[model samples]
Target: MLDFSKDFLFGVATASYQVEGAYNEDGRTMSIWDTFSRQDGKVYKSHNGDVACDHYHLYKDDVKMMKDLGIEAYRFSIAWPRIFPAKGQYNPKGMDFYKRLTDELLKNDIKPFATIYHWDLPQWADDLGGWLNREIVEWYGEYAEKLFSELGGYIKNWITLNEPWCSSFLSYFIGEHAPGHKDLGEALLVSHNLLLSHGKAVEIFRGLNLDDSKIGITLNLNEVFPASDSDDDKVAAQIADGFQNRWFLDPLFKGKYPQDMVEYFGKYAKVDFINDEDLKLISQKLDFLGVNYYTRAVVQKGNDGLLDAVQIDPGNERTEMGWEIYPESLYNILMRLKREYTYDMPLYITENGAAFNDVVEDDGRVHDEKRVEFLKQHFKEAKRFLNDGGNLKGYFVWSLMDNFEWAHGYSKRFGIVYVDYETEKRILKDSALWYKDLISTRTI
Candidate 1:
């Protein structure tokens, strides 16, 4: 049986850019995504999030689904472009929109877990070099101060940033995601500034003295596994580990970026550019840490041998998006974080879910049984980690509804609530009701 405290919160998350699509509504200015989606071959089929789920107009109905699902918290992002809209100005209408949304959550007894930036930077900021410039640390801190001063009265749990690794490396270096830039040096610089921005934001938020407010950051973490027992394979795993997990985790938790990371990206990094005692602020004691876990990494030494390591496909059962189904990695990563970095701080399974081929029948039902089982097994793994003395305080599913998925576009659906973009109809999947039962019982 799964055991959880009465105080444990259960909820789900969705990003504003990915869901609240009123691309040109009420002072809503273009963001990097707005531009990225417009570029040729940028997003899938050149598709954009112009009308994703029409969540902006249908958020009340979305909240009704959450209430029916027995969710206690809603982790959603505020689009920087939606709120700020332009350079150095606040959009009153955008603020009013969120004000109504937050009031709705409160009326239904649903807590709000708000992330300030979810990779959607205002186009103005991006034009000014975005995360690559040191001024962004202050810019982000200023933005956080503005947000807290405005929304802190309604929300107490504030996450400064979400998944810097994905925002910096994957989006910048790999160029597989939005704001696509394939420069390795830019990726390193962006990573550093993102951490600095988090620190500055936390500092600014605390400085504001908002009663009962907490600041933290979320990271998408996965455990790395070597393909073979061979020493070379093990070394390769360590290298891959440095690239994904430690490069971000160590700096945020250990107060310093791993030295090996400096060596690994030496050719691409500007080491001297890092400010004095920057990592010190990066490790400011977090009120809580959010972790999003999905699959495990199996790696081998790269034959090309140009860089450090390469990822290998283990050919496990995959979701519709072809990501391996490895629930054990969730438990492994939670335990490792508890034992290493966040031993004292409370942790939250901020995001964890799979994308499967969901079919909506004529009778208005989404038969996503595979995704249901996938979530169930992963939830059990999370319970095991908590049962073994991990300080897990909450669990939030990856998404609440299907919407604009970046790069893969709308083809991949991670939402438990099936969103018909064409018709703006929301059909709750079986997993939504199944998880709702668990939420009500506080067990599975």
Candidate 2:
């Protein structure tokens, strides 16, 4: 039996861009994602979030579904463009949406964990260099302050930014996500600015003088497993760890970027901009650390005539998202993160799920046994992470229902609930039912 414990909250996560439709409605301005998804070859089939899950209009029904699933919490993001329409205007209807959502969550007895920024920067911000500009620190601080004043009283758990690594490196350097830009220096610059913005936001939160408010940032952790015991593989693993894991973690936890990152980025980073006081501010107290676990990378020599390191294909089961399913990586990542980043601080398994090629069967039930198995396996690993003295507090599944899925659009289904795009109907998947039962047990 898989028990999550009485104190362990279970919930599902969603992003406004991925789920909430009404993209341009009620004073909502275009975001960088809205612009990016319009260009050719940008998103899958060029499908945008214009009518995703239609959760903006259908959220009450979605909350009903959550009630049915016995979800104690729901993690979601507020679209920046929706709130701060252009540069300074605040939209009343946009605020109303969240106000009603919070009311619904409270009515349903579900705690709401909100993230202020989830990579959906307003296009106006991108035009000014987005995260790459140092000016963004103040802009984001203003935005955070707006949210704190407007919704802070109700929202207890707050995430300043989500997966800043992906928001910086993946979106900017690899051009895989929204606001795609392929420049190394720009990526490094944006990465640093994102952290600075987070620090600024936290500083503003402290200035608010609020009690019972929890603030932290969410990081998508990768378990880097060296391919072999060779020195080169070990060195590659160390480099990958330093560049990927340590880059963001060091600053937030240790108050400075690791020596390896400073040496690697060289002149690209704003070392002069980073002051000793700023490090202390960046490493400010966090109520909880959110970790999104998906897959692990087996690093090797990147000498394949392309990028230097190659991903050693660990022949694990895969999902519709085509991510290898290795639950042990979750266990390994939790242990390491606790030792390095959290220490005595509590942790939250913020996002974890498998995307399977699910089909709505004739009976209208989403019988995704594969996804159920994926959750079962991962939940066990989460239990082990907790047992090993890691202060694991909560677990939020990747999604509540099938939605846009960013670049992949609706092609990849990572939800416990099935959404019929054509009919705009929501149906619970088998995995969700299983999760409800598992949560009831307080053990996996």
Candidate 3:
């Protein structure tokens, strides 16, 4: 049996913009995602989070659902636009919503894990250059300060940013997410500024000096491999890893950006923004590291513009998103972190789940056997990592219920609990029931 200690946290996660649907309620204003989704052809069918799962109005039932599932913790993010709806504007009503949510979680014996920023940049900030502007560091700091002052006592476990890679490179360079811009120079600058903001928030949390609180940042880190044995393929894989993994890891833990990538990307982006104090601030000690692992990337030697690497599918079993199912990579990543970046420090699998085309059966329950097997395989790998003396503390499945999935909108469902989007009704999938039993026994 796959089992964990009693203290290990089994949790579910959601982001505000993805789940909460009160875009214009309680003094909330537009976020970059709100604006971006409104643009024609930006989102799937131009679907917006105008009423995503109606969680904002139904949080009471949502928390009760989590309680019934027997989860020990809940990882959720705060909406930046809700808190700072406009430049130099603060809204108490927006703050009260979180306070109520935290109180409910505490009432149910579920620990509240808060993520301060999850890509919901206030439209006002985006209008003024967003993450590309160094002033964003101060803006994020101010926003985080308010959260720490209000909700820090109850939500003791905090994540500074959900995924800096997506917030920077994916949105800016790939142009798949909100405020899309395909500019490497802008992406590099945004990445640097995001780290600076993370450091600033950590500094603020330290100054708060809450005895029970712990703070960290979450990165969507990947395991990259060579598609073949050629020397060029090996180099290609290394470059892929440097681009996705080392870019943020080096700055946060090693106190410097990877020198190879620095010189390589310098051709497109000037690194003049990185000053003497930036690295010092970026590498400050943290309580833990949050790893969001999905799948591995296999690359070959090819001229793919700036990256100079081409990703090739290995024809393995895949998820609906077309990501190859490779749970062993999770074990490899945890081991690599212990050996390379965060030795002896605590680690949390903050987000790890897959999306599949699910259907409601005549029996009413969603029979998602594929998702159950996917999570089971990943949990087995996590169990091996823990038994090997890895400092893996907890695991949070990517989502609790189906919600809006960013640019893909409501088309992809990563939640174990199925949501009837039209009616806002939630039904637990077979995977969710399996998870409930696993949590009940502390075993799989």
What is the TM-score of each predicted model, taking all chains together? 0.97, 0.96, 0.98
Better of 1 and 2 by TM-score: 1
User: Which runs of model 2 end up more than 4 angstroms from their true locations?
Assistant: 267-277, 304-307
- Across 1-444, the per-residue lDDT of candidate 2 in tens digits comes to 344567688989999999998998988989999999999999999999888989999899899989988899999999999888877777778888999999899899999999999988999988987887889888898888988898876788899999998998899878989799987677777887888888898889888977788888999988887999998888788777776788889989888889876765664544445578767867888788999999888889676332357778878777776688989989988888777777878888889998898988999899999999999999889888877788888999998998888889889988898888999887889998898887676656
Q: Identify the runs in model 1 with alpha carbons over 4 angstroms from their true place.
A: 304-308
lDDT of each: 0.86, 0.86, 0.92
lDDT by residue (tens digit), candidate 3, 1-444: 547988999999999999999899998999999999999999999999989988889999999999999989999999988888888899999998999999999999999999999999998998898998899999999999999998867889999999999998889999998789998888899999999999999999899898889999999988998999999899788889999999999999999999888987887778777776999999999999999999999999897567868879888998888899999999999999999999999999999999999899999989999999999999999999999999998999988998899989999999999999879999999999999998988776
Q: Name the weakest run of 10 consecutive residues (lDDT summed) in model 3.
A: 302-311
User: Candidate 1: global Cα-lDDT?
Assistant: 0.86
TM-score winner: 3
lDDT score, residue 130, model 2?
84
Local distance difference test, candidate 2: 0.86
**Per-structure clash totals for the candidates:** 0, 11, 0
208: Cα error in model 3, Å? 1.3
Ranking 1 against 3 by lDDT, winner: 3
